[PDB]
Amino acid sequence: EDWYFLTVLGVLMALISFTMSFTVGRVVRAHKWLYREIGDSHLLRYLSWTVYPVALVSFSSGFSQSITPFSGGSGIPELKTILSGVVLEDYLDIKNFGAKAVGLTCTLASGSTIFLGKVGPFVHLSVMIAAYLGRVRAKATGESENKSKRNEMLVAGAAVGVATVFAAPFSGVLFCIEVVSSHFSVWDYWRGFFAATCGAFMFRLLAVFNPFDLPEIFFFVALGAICGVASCAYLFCQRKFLGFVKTNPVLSKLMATSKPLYSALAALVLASVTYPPGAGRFMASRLSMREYLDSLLDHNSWALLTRQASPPWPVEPDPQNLWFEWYHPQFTIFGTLAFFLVMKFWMLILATTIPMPAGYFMPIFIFGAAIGRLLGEALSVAFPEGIVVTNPIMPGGYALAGAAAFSGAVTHSISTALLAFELTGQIVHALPVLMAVLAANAIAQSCQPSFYDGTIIVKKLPYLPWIRGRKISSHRVTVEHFMNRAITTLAKDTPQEEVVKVVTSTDMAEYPLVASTESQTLVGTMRRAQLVQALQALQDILAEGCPVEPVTLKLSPETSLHQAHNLFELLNLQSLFVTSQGRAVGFVSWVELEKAISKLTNP
């Protein structure tokens, strides 16, 4: 009943996507209608523009705050942490669910003013759903599932979530795999793929309701490099900004006082810049989130068009011709693009900071695309005829590449490129874009940590494995430091009354079996229930017939923490005994490991 489980989650996710998306569409449409209709006067119009983005965000913030600390503001990093082995029980709990979806919806509605995507939150939701499903299974049939299985399920859920938001089965899962953990099995991948497929099928069902040259390649590479550089710049800012936010007593105090209020303020600020007559002509502000991307990836070469004919500024953004928003007479299209970039960067970090359920991939992708588009435009201007069979330069492709590359750099993921391709439809120029992406990754992974990684660092979540730009003394600690030094030895030489007493007292899941009280040397392990049963009906007991489970593995006190962690992850274990010169000294489990990790993180 694994396949069935996989199926069930996926369909649900798809349904959620459909509903939420629909809601977003409707509300946004309504807002648009209101904006046009309210009137010519600036005050009223301003209010309309500002209130809607503010209010929704505030509501979302409110929803986030009241439930539990890890309820809102976390998507991928927490998931990653969980995968790494250190589990946060508050994260997977479903009491969260009801608060978060609504918040996400609100965020989406708020749209291109707030400028936030839906991925991470969606992924989190999916994971939660998966967990819930698992729990039921555990309850309804058999016993409580092994940790490994649960982890796998979570991973699958995450993959499905990532696919769903995209509307892309092949790439999304891959992306999830890349980001979400360090190593990954093939079965997991397969499961993810299956989930994605299911989601796609559901979506389909729910439709009734509703040849580049070497110079070009070189250019693409350059573009990719540029994107990577930009990505790197962004990441540092993002991390530093987050740190600052965490620190500042004034800021921190304010946050403590009113989570909603700060968010509201941020929204207001965003609106003030993002107002259409004030600075929206320059930023191409008045576009939906999807619309922006479409505009960026439009087949027409803008500069040339502009030169040919001065384009009109329509009353509402033209469904066929979205690029008209990017033009201004005083600021050439290039200028507008530049404004969008820098201004977006300034805003984007701020947006990321605000405490709410929100994804930060889509915005990054858009940013990447914008730069690419700009580059393409520049190239076009340089070579109006084009590069010499004299083919014209298509900036759409460039834009796409930029989107792929910058985003990849940010996230440390080549499967961004794949996703881009999928979105496009055409794999005809698979290479140059891919190359660019790779270049970006190289530049960015060598200078900065991933966006997700950065966020994790800022949080100070218990993630043992190495991250760039994060000094920590993890190699120094050994098992002797963090082992559970208190244990309950049961030796073959001991009396029966004593054993009984011990049983009455502790009821530990697995007692060690020892040779003798003096030596304290392990010869196996005993389960507790079985022992109890035996008592109801130690050498003598053994003779009579209680089953001994042999100790399959033994850690030393002088072993490193890292190694232990790896063992726990990879072999998929629950608990393990420690032995110094053969003696039962410690009992290592996840509880202790987790504690150690926490200590390492937070001195």
Partner: antibody, heavy 111, light 107 residues
């Protein structure tokens, strides 16, 4: 209100290079637009010649790359053609235009 | 070069009727098509710079539609002053190609 006024010789002999001077009033030639040249034959079929950018990068029709040469003087705000190797088939009414927005009145060229 | 074919080459309608001149492009143009009006003798004044966008000072009756490969100039309520040739041109690619246009007479 951008206004373009052509001027030059009407009658020309074949195998002798012709030149048309288009003066501009309203906008500067140094602005970022497509300052194109176009001609219409006696049978009323239009052919696009080419244009100069703000910087000076000339772009021509592939079919007429050999013979066409287009230049400007930024002081006077004007456009100069220098169409060489003139043939009786080239006989047409010429049109000096700023992109697509505004077209000049034009002059009738005769070979 | 990208050829602009168009039809119908000649038309004859009364005052008040509708006329629809259609242009067809070989390759994909997008929406980057401009329509003109040339009265015999005078310069060809632009009417519609992008399909579904009239130039300032032009009557509302001159409507333009289409995208991709096929485009249509529709004129409703024809007056006596609309005796003219009407060309479509594209400017997505280079070189810029004009259709031969259509001479229009009235009864």
């Amino acid at each position: 209100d951008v206004q373009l006024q052509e001027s030059g010789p009407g009658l020309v002999k074949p195998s002798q290079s012709l030149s048309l001077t288009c003066t501009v009033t309203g906008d500067s030639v140094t602005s970022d637009y497509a300052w194109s040249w176009i001609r219409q034959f006696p049978g009323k079929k239009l052919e696009w010649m080419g244009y100069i950018t703000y910087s000076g990068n000339t772009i021509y029709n592939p079919s007429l790359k050999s013979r066409i040469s287009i230049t400007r003087d930024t002081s006077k705000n004007q456009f100069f053609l220098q169409l060489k190797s003139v043939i009786i088939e080239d006989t047409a009414t010429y049109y000096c235009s700023r992109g697509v927005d505004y077209w000049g009145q034009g002059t009738s060229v005769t070979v | 070069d990208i050829v602009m074919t168009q039809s119908p080459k000649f038309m004859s309608t009364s005052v008040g009727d509708r006329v629809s001149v259609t242009c067809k492009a070989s390759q994909n143009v997008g929406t980057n098509v401009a329509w003109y009006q040339q009265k015999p003798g005078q310069s060809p004044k632009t009417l519609i710079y992008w399909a579904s966008y009239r130039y300032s000072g032009v009557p509302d009756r001159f409507t333009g539609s289409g995208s991709g490969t096929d485009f249509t100039l529709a004129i409703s309520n024809v007056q006596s002053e609309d005796l003219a040739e009407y060309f479509c041109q594209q400017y997505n690619s280079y070189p810029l190609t004009f259709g031969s246009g259509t001479k229009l007479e009235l009864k």
